[PDB]
Amino acid sequence: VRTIKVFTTVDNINLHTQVVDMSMTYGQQFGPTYLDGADVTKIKPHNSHEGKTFYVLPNDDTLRVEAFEYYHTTDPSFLGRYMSALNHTKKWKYPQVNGLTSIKWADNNSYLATALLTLQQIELKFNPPALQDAYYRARAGEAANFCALILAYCNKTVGELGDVRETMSYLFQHANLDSCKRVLNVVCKTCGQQQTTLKGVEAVMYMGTLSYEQFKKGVQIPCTCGKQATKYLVQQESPFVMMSAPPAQYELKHGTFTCASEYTGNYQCGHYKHITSKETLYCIDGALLTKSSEYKGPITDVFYKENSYTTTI
Ligand SMILES: Cc1ccc(/C=N\O)cc1C(=O)N[C@H](C)c1cccc2ccccc12
Ligand SMILES: [Cl-]
Ligand SMILES: [Cl-]
Ligand SMILES: [Cl-]
Ligand SMILES: [Zn+2]
Ligand SMILES: [Zn+2]
Ligand SMILES: [Zn+2]
Ligand SMILES: [Zn+2]
């Protein structure tokens, strides 16, 4: 028998000594086995594998519990989807642009670069240790793992056309936004006045307008009575808000927002860029950087800082 030694893991924290037969495939002995993203199930051990760390699909209770504790999912496809993504994201370039980890354009990743840039500018704690650890590494310039995890958590494959607002919504659902509270008042001439409290993701995301100020003053929405009613923001408790609308020409003013998603072209197959408010306006286009004191262009998301807001109405 001819047998190198390896470590198996689901989380790359808890490592298990295995001694593998070199005649038999990884698949025969562990089930689905991966190396640095690369599916090696049907391959047999090369000598240069000695003492390396393979990811395996959980196949005992120990590994299922470890996988849930690390990823916060029992989805048996999760590991394979994560590894398939990582196989690409480890080949992407992550240049520092204006002090932020960006992504050089590849594999339709403009939406992922825009999300990654945004996440470095808002306050968020991820529930899954996998996401938290990778977010810290990405902020320090090593974003491959974080990008692979984002794809796996959003049910996206490399090359798939992604929406930044949907991606942020999925990420927010994996974050601690419990303290986040939104109180709305709705005013109809007929049904009258109704207040509702939103919590978590629904407290920090709105679709319909880019302007936080315009949200505070009120926006026109349909009432169930059939009339148009006024929805306005009573109370906001969150470290940020995300205001989205279908793309449209919008003016961004230095110092009045944190950052924004620019989107150019047709539904689904357009291109995102990222606008950030520093000492002036920076436009991050993957590896490309431009700056200007003023900006007008097609915006679909705007992010703003918050802590505690109460209306004067
Ligand atoms: C880029 C993208 C990827 C996937 C999806 C939805 N399903 O797969 C959608 C978009 C999208 O076009 N989002 C932009 C920001 C968008 C969002 C909302 C309305 C839009 C109307 C016209 C053009 C673009 C519009
Ligand atoms: Cl493990
Ligand atoms: Cl969970
Ligand atoms: Cl979670
Ligand atoms: Zn273990
Ligand atoms: Zn969780
Ligand atoms: Zn690729
Ligand atoms: Zn009504």
Closest atom of ligand 1 relative to the 269 alpha carbon: 1
Name the residue range of residue 161's domain: 57-180
- Helix, strand and coil percent figures for the chain, each rounded to 5: 25, 35, 40
**Pocket of ligand 1 contains residue 136 by CB under 6 Å:** no
Resolution (A): 2.0
Alpha helices in 154-240 (DSSP H): 164-173, 201-204, 212-217
The total of other beta-carbon atoms located within 10 Å of residue 105's CB is 16
φ, ψ for residue 25 (rounded to 5)?
-70, 155
Please answer whether residues 168 and 118 qualify as being in contact, where contact means their C-beta atoms are separated by less than 8 angstroms.
yes
Domain end call among 161, 180, 199: 180
CA 165 to chain CA centroid, Å, is 9
In this structure, which ligand is nearest to the CA of 190?
8
205 forms beta bridges with 242
Please provide the distance, in angstroms rounded to a whole number, between the alpha carbons at the two ends of the chain: 80
Task: Note residues around ion ligand 2 (Cβ under 5 angstroms).
Answer: 9-11, 14, 66
Give the Cα separation of 122 and 239 in Å (integer).
8
Query: Do 32 and 77 sit in the same domain of this protein?
Result: no
**Pocket of ligand 1 contains residue 248 by CB under 6 Å:** no
Expt. technique: X-ray
Query: Do 156 and 62 sit in the same domain of this protein?
Result: yes
Number of separate domains in the chain: 3
Please answer whether residues 237 and 308 qualify as being in contact, where contact means their C-beta atoms are separated by less than 8 angstroms.
yes
Please answer whether residues 299 and 246 qualify as being in contact, where contact means their C-beta atoms are separated by less than 8 angstroms.
no
Q: Supply 240's token pair.
A: 């940020």
Tokens 């924290």 belong to: 13
Residue identifier of the C-alpha nearest atom 16 of ligand 1: 246
Give the Cα separation of 288 and 286 in Å (integer).
6
**Pocket of ligand 1 contains residue 163 by CB under 6 Å:** yes
Q: CA 86, 102, 113, 307: dihedral to nearest 10 degrees?
A: 120
Query: Do 187 and 310 sit in the same domain of this protein?
Result: yes
Q: Which helix (H) or strand (E) holds 117?
A: helix 110-119
Contacting residues for 249 by C-beta, under 8 A, at least 6 apart: 296, 297, 298
Give the Cα separation of 271 and 112 in Å (integer).
11
- Strands 5-9 and 53-56, how do they pair? parallel
Query: Do 85 and 43 sit in the same domain of this protein?
Result: no
- Strands 281-285 and 271-277, how do they pair? antiparallel
Measured on CA atoms in the order 217, 169, 101, 274, is the torsion positive or negative? negative
**Residue type present at position 151:** L
Query: Do 235 and 293 sit in the same domain of this protein?
Result: yes
Residue identifier of the C-alpha nearest atom 21 of ligand 1: 246
Please answer whether residues 132 and 125 qualify as being in contact, where contact means their C-beta atoms are separated by less than 8 angstroms.
yes
